[PDB]
Symmetry: D2
Subunit: 283 residues, 4 copies
């Protein structure tokens, strides 16, 4: 598989959306797994998930790497509501657009915020919920906020340098020497090719700051089977949120990877793949 | 051969440091790559009783499984120990491996058996493959939980005044869903208590000589070179959840998995998931 | 001072209350400190606070040891709403009853739940907020619930034995050999003399379980200056709630006492007294 | 006499283990019962710079206050250390106490000075009264926070490439309210960096010989017999909050106090409350 071969578009008309173009990548057939990416500059379905799409297809799954409204080759937008609840509507849109009655969601960071909102609003349309260091769960009992990674993320949004992006990625990864060009250019090309997303994000962050995303009091309402993954060394979202989810969602389990940043799916691909595939297959 | 507690039951004399001609009971099945499972420290614990829901699937996955009765438990020989039990138990595991000609084994350890597995990986790094830990005991204070924990107090209470009803109370604290407690489980533990009452008294004499605080190997976790799978039950009232994080941070190559709606026996209360996760870890980690 | 010398009653008519008799003890003059006791069988203003009333009066404070609706010499009742919100109304009642325009609150356990609700509903009537291991803040990130102390509390409510009460107190105190008769009889006489409170409590616990008391999502609304105290070895409410309060209340500080159970005010009287007096005097 | 940085400034030669005729700078005022205050480990740190908001009130409360410049900081003599800095610093504190005929002192320690205070209480239990710790360094891994922490990375960055703007970045991470950072604070630290650049390079050479992981005294906290007051800033990005709990659980007689809206300098960012709480602890604990 490649990005080219899998590339695809489709408009959506849910709630406040209307004739809104969502880019995505699709492969495989059958049961549907929608993978939702992180909030960083130049973030996209493919870029977040290029080590998990193949193995998930082989497992006999319909794999949808969605570009969320306002990133990569999807359409630009400005939100005055918390992006989790908004991205969920975009997801609900792409499912209605493509006749998908139900899907499993895999949400990393902002994505995980999306999946959590999707699961809260549209429970009848979610199968199983995989969360990987999801944002927007309020304050940590230990980490002061903003966290080091979030600081760097806004710094990159503000002054998109090549050297800055690099330093953002050295904080996102536990092992910094794992930095590939195919990754680094994937993000750097994505920021350049649509620099309207950057300014749109900062404005939205002004209208709905991270503190408004907190869905914590509603967690006792999530019914789907939940698999929470965390990188032990995540400098973007604090480890103790993993526990908050475990205690509040009725049916959850938590897996933490050592020597791992915010990208468990990337930095620990193999283990992540087989752990999640098995969770879908057997839980 | 049918796989039953009796058809798998075996004995081996071990000779290692402070053990001479010491009879160790174990249950064994399967062939090839070896997994040794080490049980908890409560009255009447033993290998079969802790691991009977795991043995079949591990054997079917192609492992040789050894459910070891630790010294001073169940059908192994009696002992009063004057050193910390994790280390003495690890000597016995090594003794059993030498006696059975086993060069390397994966270790699965629950509670006291987790402490055993950790001491074994510290002392005998060349003889361990992978390490699987389920809520290991004796890792010092918790950052949140007052000690002794509720499970620990019931453990000592049962050791000192054994009764069926106190056994039942203990087991109700050990498990998240107390309605899963069968009369057969209970009667198995109760028979082990009644058939080997010397183990209880010897345990109490030994704990006075080397209290639980002496089992703390925290300072050495940095030496462990085995790939490690830590499992915890979210609802464990015996050893606290923050110890799972302590191991995750101090062992070089670890992952942690926490089961919801689970007390201190994840291998038993969530056997199917446990089996699937650990088998997968042994095969592909 | 003694219980006799300070004993006093007054009816109240707030919201659902009407001609409802609140017992309390008062001493001293000037600025008002209302001390609110814990949820245990035979719990009462005096019994919780007999080492803190004298020293607080000397400090020049008006000290009100309130018996909460349904304990000790106050009137019996059954609640179908979480007792924190209900006890707050009773407190708001005793203040209107006695022409108190403002007060500082000192809440231990159930009391702390009260103070937190009082501070949320009636902020204009609260000065400064002292919380000592307050209940009803949801699940712990570490302790499974119900906690050992809560289990024992309901066991004592169910079968009020003298030996049972004793075992409840051995779990409430870090140092068990500190058990005094003047305490033990204070509780044992209180349970006997009004055994209707016991059954009323169990029914209310049925109508509004501990899980309904959680005010966590509203903590960002508390404006009063807050002093959170905790016993390190508290087996009734988990230590990590101390942190939750610290992070969520806008103006808070946290003090933890070593070798200390649920009764910081009792087990560490001196240090507690001077710490709180100074907080009132200078914060 | 007026109390100013200069009117209080003194030197004393110390001779203790690996120190011979080693000049220690300190600031001193007041008389009687002795409190020694030990500073942090960042570039340009020193006693005055860390504690100038505390000295007046402690002296007025009736204490003799000593703000000590640790070896290889500020106006004390230069040194490249080959052992963990907490212990070497504790030797220097003991050396200063012997040279000034001080039998017993209360110790207040911030960050590196907290590590110093802990080593001193371990090694010289008879020479300490009470122990006050503010976010002490080197207590090993955190259960929540990735390491090195953000403050630590800025510390090493500033040591290796000193610049005024990097100093400002560091100080902005140290403090909760960055708008409290005065030009005078900045210029004081910056002058100490520029006037003693050898301290920076010596610090880096020393940290290669005994890294921060070697400062961990966790395993010994159980030996500390001093009544201990632990203070933390909720918002500390240099040493993590769970270490406050680690000390609370492992030292026999401790209390913990956490200030909201506070980074790693509680003594400075919340001086008034800090002063009031610690003075009260010294008088009545």
């Amino acid at each position: 598989l490649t990005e080219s071969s899998t590339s695809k578009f489709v408009k959506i008309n849910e709630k406040g959306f209307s004739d809104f173009n969502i880019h995505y990548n699709e492969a495989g057939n059958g049961e549907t797994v929608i993978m939702l990416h992180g909030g960083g500059p130049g973030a996209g379905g493919w870029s977040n998930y290029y080590r998990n799409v193949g193995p998930f297809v082989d497992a006999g799954y319909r794999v949808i790497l969605k570009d969320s409204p306002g990133f990569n080759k999807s359409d630009a937008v400005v939100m005055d509501e918390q992006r989790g609840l908004v991205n969920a509507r975009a997801v609900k849109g792409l499912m209605d657009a493509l006749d998908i009655d139900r899907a499993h969601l895999v949400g990393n960071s902002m994505g995980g915020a999306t999946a959590l909102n999707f699961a809260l609003e549209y429970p009848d349309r979610i199968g199983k919920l995989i969360l990987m260091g999801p944002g927007g769960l309020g304050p940590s009992m230990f980490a002061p906020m903003p966290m080091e990674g979030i600081k760097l993320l806004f710094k990159l949004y503000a002054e998109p340098s090549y050297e800055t992006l690099k330093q953002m990625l050295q904080v996102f990864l536990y092992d910094q020497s794992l930095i590939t060009e195919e990754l680094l250019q994937g993000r750097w090309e994505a920021i350049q090719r649509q620099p309207e997303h950057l300014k749109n994000f900062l404005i939205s962050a002004q209208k709905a700051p991270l503190s408004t995303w907190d869905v914590t009091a509603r967690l006792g309402e999530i019914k789907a089977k939940t698999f929470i993954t965390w990188g032990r060394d995540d400098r973007f979202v604090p480890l103790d949120h993993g526990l908050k989810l475990l205690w509040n969602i009725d049916d959850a389990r938590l897996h933490v990877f050592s020597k791992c940043g915010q990208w468990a799916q990337w930095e620990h691909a193999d283990e992540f793949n087989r752990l999640v595939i098995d969770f879908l297959r057997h839980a």
